[PDB]
Design an enzyme around this catalytic site. Structure first.
Site, PDB file in Angstrom:
ATOM      1  N   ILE A  71     -28.477 -60.434 -20.706  1.00 17.16           N
ATOM      2  CA  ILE A  71     -28.565 -59.565 -21.871  1.00 17.16           C
ATOM      3  C   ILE A  71     -28.268 -60.280 -23.190  1.00 17.16           C
ATOM      4  CG2 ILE A  71     -27.012 -57.891 -22.995  1.00 17.16           C
ATOM      5  CD1 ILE A  71     -29.977 -57.466 -21.018  1.00 17.16           C
ATOM      6  N   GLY A  72     -27.681 -61.474 -23.096  1.00 12.99           N
ATOM      7  CA  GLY A  72     -27.378 -62.266 -24.275  1.00 12.99           C
ATOM      8  C   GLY A  72     -26.536 -63.480 -23.948  1.00 12.99           C
TER       9      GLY A  72
ATOM     10  N   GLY B 103     -23.977 -66.770 -25.678  1.00 12.52           N
ATOM     11  CA  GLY B 103     -23.286 -67.426 -26.764  1.00 12.52           C
ATOM     12  C   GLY B 103     -22.932 -68.895 -26.719  1.00 12.52           C
ATOM     13  N   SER B 104     -22.920 -69.511 -25.535  1.00 11.12           N
ATOM     14  CA  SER B 104     -22.431 -70.891 -25.453  1.00 11.12           C
ATOM     15  C   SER B 104     -21.262 -70.985 -26.442  1.00 11.12           C
ATOM     16  CB  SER B 104     -23.521 -71.914 -25.802  1.00 11.12           C
ATOM     17  OG  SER B 104     -23.007 -73.240 -25.760  1.00 11.12           O
ATOM     18  N   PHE B 105     -20.169 -70.298 -26.147  1.00 11.58           N
ATOM     19  CA  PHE B 105     -19.811 -69.904 -24.793  1.00 11.58           C
ATOM     20  C   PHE B 105     -19.957 -68.415 -24.530  1.00 11.58           C
ATOM     21  CE2 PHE B 105     -15.751 -69.262 -27.124  1.00 11.58           C
ATOM     22  CZ  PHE B 105     -16.103 -70.057 -28.205  1.00 11.58           C
ATOM     23  N   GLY B 106     -20.214 -68.098 -23.271  1.00 12.93           N
ATOM     24  CA  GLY B 106     -20.342 -66.728 -22.842  1.00 12.93           C
ATOM     25  C   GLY B 106     -21.796 -66.319 -22.717  1.00 12.93           C
TER      26      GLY B 106
ATOM     27  N   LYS C  54     -19.654 -60.563 -18.884  1.00 13.05           N
ATOM     28  CA  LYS C  54     -19.743 -61.822 -19.604  1.00 13.05           C
ATOM     29  C   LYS C  54     -19.045 -62.928 -18.819  1.00 13.05           C
ATOM     30  CE  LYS C  54     -17.932 -61.871 -23.742  1.00 13.05           C
ATOM     31  NZ  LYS C  54     -16.607 -62.372 -24.199  1.00 13.05           N
TER      32      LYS C  54
ATOM     33  N   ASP D 232     -12.630 -59.222 -36.692  1.00 13.04           N
ATOM     34  CA  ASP D 232     -14.060 -59.402 -36.897  1.00 13.04           C
ATOM     35  C   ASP D 232     -14.879 -58.146 -37.144  1.00 13.04           C
ATOM     36  OD1 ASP D 232     -16.407 -60.730 -37.223  1.00 13.04           O
ATOM     37  OD2 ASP D 232     -16.116 -62.021 -35.495  1.00 13.04           O
TER      38      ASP D 232
HETATM   39  C1  LIG Z   1     -12.003 -63.988 -27.124  1.00  6.18           C
HETATM   40  C2  LIG Z   1     -12.008 -62.613 -27.294  1.00  6.18           C
HETATM   41  C3  LIG Z   1     -10.818 -61.927 -27.535  1.00  6.18           C
HETATM   42  C4  LIG Z   1     -10.782 -60.537 -27.718  1.00  6.18           C
HETATM   43  C5  LIG Z   1     -11.984 -59.835 -27.644  1.00  6.18           C
HETATM   44  N1  LIG Z   1     -12.126 -58.522 -27.801  1.00  6.18           N
HETATM   45  N2  LIG Z   1     -11.531 -57.995 -28.622  1.00  6.18           N
HETATM   46  C6  LIG Z   1     -12.062 -56.804 -28.759  1.00  6.18           C
HETATM   47  C7  LIG Z   1     -11.425 -55.702 -29.614  1.00  6.18           C
HETATM   48  C8  LIG Z   1     -11.151 -56.264 -31.007  1.00  6.18           C
HETATM   49  C9  LIG Z   1     -12.351 -54.476 -29.679  1.00  6.18           C
HETATM   50  C10 LIG Z   1     -10.108 -55.294 -28.976  1.00  6.18           C
HETATM   51  C11 LIG Z   1     -13.191 -56.784 -28.049  1.00  6.18           C
HETATM   52  C12 LIG Z   1     -13.359 -58.059 -27.669  1.00  6.18           C
HETATM   53  N3  LIG Z   1     -14.201 -58.180 -26.664  1.00  6.18           N
HETATM   54  C13 LIG Z   1     -15.454 -57.715 -26.573  1.00  6.18           C
HETATM   55  O1  LIG Z   1     -15.945 -56.958 -27.399  1.00  6.18           O
HETATM   56  N4  LIG Z   1     -16.050 -58.015 -25.392  1.00  6.18           N
HETATM   57  C14 LIG Z   1     -17.306 -57.667 -25.047  1.00  6.18           C
HETATM   58  C15 LIG Z   1     -18.160 -56.960 -25.874  1.00  6.18           C
HETATM   59  C16 LIG Z   1     -19.464 -56.687 -25.473  1.00  6.18           C
HETATM   60  C17 LIG Z   1     -19.883 -56.998 -24.177  1.00  6.18           C
HETATM   61  O2  LIG Z   1     -21.106 -56.554 -23.715  1.00  6.18           O
HETATM   62  C18 LIG Z   1     -21.840 -56.282 -24.893  1.00  6.18           C
HETATM   63  C19 LIG Z   1     -23.277 -55.769 -24.681  1.00  6.18           C
HETATM   64  N5  LIG Z   1     -23.386 -54.355 -24.328  1.00  6.18           N
HETATM   65  C20 LIG Z   1     -22.524 -53.991 -23.212  1.00  6.18           C
HETATM   66  C21 LIG Z   1     -22.691 -52.497 -22.911  1.00  6.18           C
HETATM   67  O3  LIG Z   1     -24.079 -52.222 -22.558  1.00  6.18           O
HETATM   68  C22 LIG Z   1     -24.911 -52.585 -23.632  1.00  6.18           C
HETATM   69  C23 LIG Z   1     -24.779 -54.054 -23.978  1.00  6.18           C
HETATM   70  C24 LIG Z   1     -18.927 -57.414 -23.256  1.00  6.18           C
HETATM   71  C25 LIG Z   1     -19.337 -57.691 -21.952  1.00  6.18           C
HETATM   72  C26 LIG Z   1     -18.478 -58.265 -21.035  1.00  6.18           C
HETATM   73  C27 LIG Z   1     -17.210 -58.628 -21.458  1.00  6.18           C
HETATM   74  C28 LIG Z   1     -16.807 -58.421 -22.778  1.00  6.18           C
HETATM   75  C29 LIG Z   1     -17.674 -57.846 -23.702  1.00  6.18           C
HETATM   76  C30 LIG Z   1     -13.169 -60.534 -27.376  1.00  6.18           C
HETATM   77  C31 LIG Z   1     -13.202 -61.911 -27.226  1.00  6.18           C
END
Ligand SMILES: Cc1ccc(-n2nc(C(C)(C)C)cc2NC(=O)Nc2ccc(OCCN3CCOCC3)c3ccccc23)cc1
Length: 259
Positions: free
Chosen positions: A16-17, A19-22, A36, A129
């Site tokens: 679905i997407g 990032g390198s990384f992820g 992810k 972010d």
């Molecule tokens: C390093 C790091 C540290 C913290 C975070 N963290 N912090 C937050 C807060 C701020 C909201 C708490 C959120 C994030 N993380 C995310 O927002 N994580 C993700 C978003 C979208 C994804 O899938 C998106 C696509 N979407 C999924 C649903 O179906 C439609 C497609 C994900 C898929 C699998 C795993 C994580 C995902 C993230 C990274």
């Protein structure tokens, strides 16, 4: 509690997407999911961080407007599982689509986002972010906040953030400010600094203080109370900015009126 998902239980659909990384795939675990993972054969020490941390944070969120964290896994390759949602990012609907929202929707989008954001902050979480990309519209209906960024932007950076300052630039405040732009986005329907092409200009001009969103752009319909509140978050000085409880409270009051 225990969120580790036994090995090989999950099933990875189409990418679905990335990032390198992820990279995120559409999966199947007891229904639909999104996962992810870092496909790198062996997890580096770096990565083993982005994993450790991101689960650290997500574990602590249960809210309607926060994207739903489901579980994590290590063995086949490090992975993070969340609900699968149908819909498109706000950024998408706004700038990526002909899509026109009734002010009601727009207002509510804002309400839901503030509900989401207030929750984090209460739980002592700084998003760091926020932006229309990272706001997801589920069933096109309800708002799911998260970090969809696979690389770790400028338009939403509060000035004290753009200036490196004391290197502890991020605060609930910066978040208020990023929120403020999202409102600018919702009410105008345009991203800020529209007629400004060189993207390097904005970076210096905004942090120096010479530049802030030109609010004449907010459309005609936007309630006064709203445009105010916007201008409020966009207030250049951190302590000039309202706190999300103040914000949601406001925003709930605006809607009761337009009802
Ligand atoms: C390093 C790091 C540290 C913290 C975070 N963290 N912090 C937050 C807060 C701020 C909201 C708490 C959120 C994030 N993380 C995310 O927002 N994580 C993700 C978003 C979208 C994804 O899938 C998106 C696509 N979407 C999924 C649903 O179906 C439609 C497609 C994900 C898929 C699998 C795993 C994580 C995902 C993230 C990274």
């Amino acid at each position: 509690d225990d969120w580790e998902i036994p090995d090989g239980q999950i099933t990875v659909g189409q990418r679905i997407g990335s990032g390198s990384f992820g990279t995120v795939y559409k999966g199947k675990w007891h229904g639909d999911v999104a996962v992810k993972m870092l496909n790198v054969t062996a997890p580096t020490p770096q990565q083993l961080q982005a994993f450790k941390n991101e689960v650290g944070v997500l574990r602590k969120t249960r809210h309607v407007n926060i994207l739903l964290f489901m579980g994590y896994s290590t063995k086949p390759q490090l992975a993070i599982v969340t609900q699968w949602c149908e819909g498109s990012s706000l950024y998408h609907h706004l700038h990526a689509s002909e899509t026109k929202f009734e002010m009601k929707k727009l207002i509510d989008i804002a309400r839901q986002t503030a509900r989401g954001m207030d929750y984090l902050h209460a739980k002592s979480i700084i998003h760091r972010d926020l932006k229309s990309n990272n706001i997801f519209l589920h069933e096109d209906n309800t708002v799911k906040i998260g970090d969809f960024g696979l690389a770790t932007s400028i338009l939403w950076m509060a000035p004290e953030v753009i200036r490196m300052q004391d290197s502890n630039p991020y605060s609930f405040q910066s978040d208020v400010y990023a929120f403020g732009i999202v409102l600018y986005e919702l009410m105008t329907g345009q991203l800020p600094y529209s007629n400004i092409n060189n993207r390097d200009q904005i970076i210096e001009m905004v942090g120096r203080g010479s530049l802030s969103p030109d609010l004449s752009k907010v459309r005609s319909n936007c309630p006064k109370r709203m445009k105010r509140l916007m201008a409020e978050c966009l207030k250049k000085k951190r302590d000039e900015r309202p706190s999300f409880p103040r914000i949601l409270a406001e925003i709930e009051e605006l809607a009761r009126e337009l009802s």
